Amino acid sequence: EDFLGCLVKEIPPRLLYAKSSPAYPSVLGQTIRNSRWSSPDNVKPLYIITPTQVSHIQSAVVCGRRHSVRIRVRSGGHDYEGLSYRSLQPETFAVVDLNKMRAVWVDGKARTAWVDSGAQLGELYYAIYKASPTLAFPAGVCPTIGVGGNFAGGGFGMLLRKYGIAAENVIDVKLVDANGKLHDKKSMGDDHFWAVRGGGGESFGIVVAWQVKLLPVPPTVTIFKISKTVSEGAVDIINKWQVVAPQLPADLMIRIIAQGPKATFEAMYLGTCKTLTPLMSSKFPELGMNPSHCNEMSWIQSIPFVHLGHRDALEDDLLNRQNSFKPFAEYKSDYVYQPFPKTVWEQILNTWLVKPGAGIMIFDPYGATISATPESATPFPHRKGVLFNIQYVNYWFAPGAAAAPLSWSKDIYNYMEPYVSKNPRQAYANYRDIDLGRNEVVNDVSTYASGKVWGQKYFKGNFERLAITKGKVDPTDYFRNEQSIPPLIK
Numbered sequence: 001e002d003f004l005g006c007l008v009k010e011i012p013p014r015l016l017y018a019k020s021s022p023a024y025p026s027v028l029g030q031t032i033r034n035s036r037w038s039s040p041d042n043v044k045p046l047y048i049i050t051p052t053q054v055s056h057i058q059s060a061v062v063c064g065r066r067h068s069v070r071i072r073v074r075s076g077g078h079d080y081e082g083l084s085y086r087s088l089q090p091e092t093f094a095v096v097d098l099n100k101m102r103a104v105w106v107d108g109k110a111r112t113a114w115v116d117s118g119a120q121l122g123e124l125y126y127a128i129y130k131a132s133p134t135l136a137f138p139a140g141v142c143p144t145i146g147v148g149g150n151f152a153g154g155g156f157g158m159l160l161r162k163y164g165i166a167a168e169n170v171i172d173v174k175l176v177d178a179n180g181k182l183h184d185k186k187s188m189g190d191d192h193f194w195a196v197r198g199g200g201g202e203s204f205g206i207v208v209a210w211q212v213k214l215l216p217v218p219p220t221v222t223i224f225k226i227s228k229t230v231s232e233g234a235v236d237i238i239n240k241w242q243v244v245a246p247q248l249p250a251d252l253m254i255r256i257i258a259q260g261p262k263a264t265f266e267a268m269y270l271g272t273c274k275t276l277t278p279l280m281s282s283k284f285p286e287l288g289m290n291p292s293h294c295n296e297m298s299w300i301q302s303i304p305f306v307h308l309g310h311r312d313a314l315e316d317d318l319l320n321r322q323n324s325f326k327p328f329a330e331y332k333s334d335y336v337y338q339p340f341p342k343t344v345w346e347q348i349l350n351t352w353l354v355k356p357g358a359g360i361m362i363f364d365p366y367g368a369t370i371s372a373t374p375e376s377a378t379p380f381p382h383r384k385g386v387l388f389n390i391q392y393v394n395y396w397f398a399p400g401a402a403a404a405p406l407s408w409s410k411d412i413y414n415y416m417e418p419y420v421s422k423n424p425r426q427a428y429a430n431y432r433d434i435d436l437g438r439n440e441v442v443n444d445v446s447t448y449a450s451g452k453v454w455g456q457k458y459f460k461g462n463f464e465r466l467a468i469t470k471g472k473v474d475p476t477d478y479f480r481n482e483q484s485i486p487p488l489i490k
């Protein structure tokens with residue numbers, strides 16, 4: 001009551017929703033992307049605020065401090081555990097939902113842009129396209145991902161070998177801190193500005209907007225998608241890929257999707273069929289690539305083409321907010337520094353991918369620019385020596401069908417333990433996986449020791465600096481969730 005009273009005083013009432021508001025269920029559900037987290041057994045926010053101005057965010061945070069009510073911020077709602085809009089255990093929180101703050105302003109000539117956190121990647125990419133056919137930004141593959149969470153947790157996609165992660169291409173921010181204060185890079189200082197760009201969402205304050213540098217791409221890029229079944233030699237070919245792909249020139253990224261005894265090699269090349277053909281013949285002849293495989297197109301066209309296989313529907317694929325794809329979903333991730341033995345690839349393709357509840361495995365090769373950044377230069381530590389990342393994705397479509405995929409996800413992660421990174425076993429912060437560990441709260445503050453268990457997996461040697469920065473900007477642990485950076489204070 002106290003908290004709501006404060007909000008009503010400062011923010012338009014049409015932007016405030018209580019559980020009893022008729023529109024609350026659809027406001028809550030509008031960017032939930034995982035059917036596991038939409039059902040009524042999930043813990044719901046007491047209130048939802050949908051700011052349209054930065055002053056509304058500040059008022060909301062000031063109210064939350066005064067009345068001791070915590071806020072989970074949501075931009076695109078893609079959090080794998082839904083931590084932008086649900087808690088694991090009953091507790092009081094409000095959601096500050098940024099979907100209405102979605103402006104993107106591109107300065108083509110300066111090659112910079114200001115992008116609101118509530119914009120989806122598709123909208124950012126489209127706006128860049130309206131400004132220039134030869135500029136791009138290196139962020140996620142899926143068009144509906146929110147800018148806010150994608151950037152805060154790092155953010156990578158088919159330009160990662162060329163330009164690294166989204167967070168290392170951010171040149172300023174506009175942020176509201178745990179005391180409701182408005183900050184930019186200059187006011188927040190090196191530590192806070194280092195942490196917010198890749199140190200995970202929520203922990204370091206609400207980013208309202210990000211200023212990004214825009215990067216050159218040729219007017220024509222080339223995509224191929226070449227599949228090999230095991231009888232076509234997928235095992236030998238992927239065994240070679242793991243050594244070659246991380247060593248390829250930075251203009252060529254070849255990722256793999258596998259969902260049975262068959263691997264599809266999806267490439268984005270910053271250039272033409274005419275130069276890709278000889279490069280492949282020279283560096284990776286085992287794949288058997290020829291000019292018939294080439295799909296030449298602009299960078300903007302490559303986004304729906306890579307993610308959805310569509311060539312013909314630019315605006316609908318990039319500017320969509322209908323939220324129609326809502327699988328029940330589980331996800332895990334690993335990083336690989338040493339080549340798998342051929343026998344492991346044999347097991348993966350022939351055995352693991354043919355079990356009840358078996359999911360899809362995606363393999364993104366590193367090296368080049370992403371690996372050239374030192375491990376501590378940003379909070380994202382998965383850099384020098386990384387051959388590839390693995391994402392293990394399970395989708396299902398009926399609420400009664402969870403047992404087999406959940407069980408497969410657990411089993412394959414156990415199987416893979418000897419072959420992937422260890423001490424710690426690294427994982428990508430934006431592929432959030434609560435089973436890596438969760439925080440313990442003592443005297444209303446997340447403990448450092450509990451945070452460290454999962455924190456070293458996402459952030460490796462960067463965890464302690466993240467926590468010291470957290471202690472400086474938010475010593476009372478106001479902006480938190482079950483897996484956010486704990487404050488390390490003296």
Ligand SMILES: *Cc1cc2c(c(*)c1C)Nc1c([nH]c(=O)[nH]c1=O)N2C[C@H](O)[C@H](O)[C@H](O)COP(=O)(O)OP(=O)(O)OC[C@H]1O[C@@H](n2cnc3c(N)ncnc32)[C@H](O)[C@@H]1O
Pocket residue numbers: 033072073074075076077078079080082083084098117139140141142144145146147148149150152153154155156157200201202203205206207208430431481
């Ligand atoms: C759903 C999904 C997710 C990803 C891909 C595809 C699809 C369909 N593919 C992908 C991803 N990540 C990549 O780097 N490359 C890819 O190709 N996926 C994961 C995605 O990057 C993460 O889920 C990301 O955190 C989602 O961001 P979001 O859509 O904005 O999600 P939430 O609103 O749930 O927020 C996540 C997390 O960050 C905090 N948060 C949200 N907004 C802010 C702001 N403005 N400031 C600070 N912190 C923020 C949330 O509280 C939550 O903890």
Ligand code: NA
Pocket residue numbers: 421422423424
């Ligand atoms: Na290690």
Ligand code: NA
Pocket residue numbers: 080081330331432433434435
């Ligand atoms: Na999970």
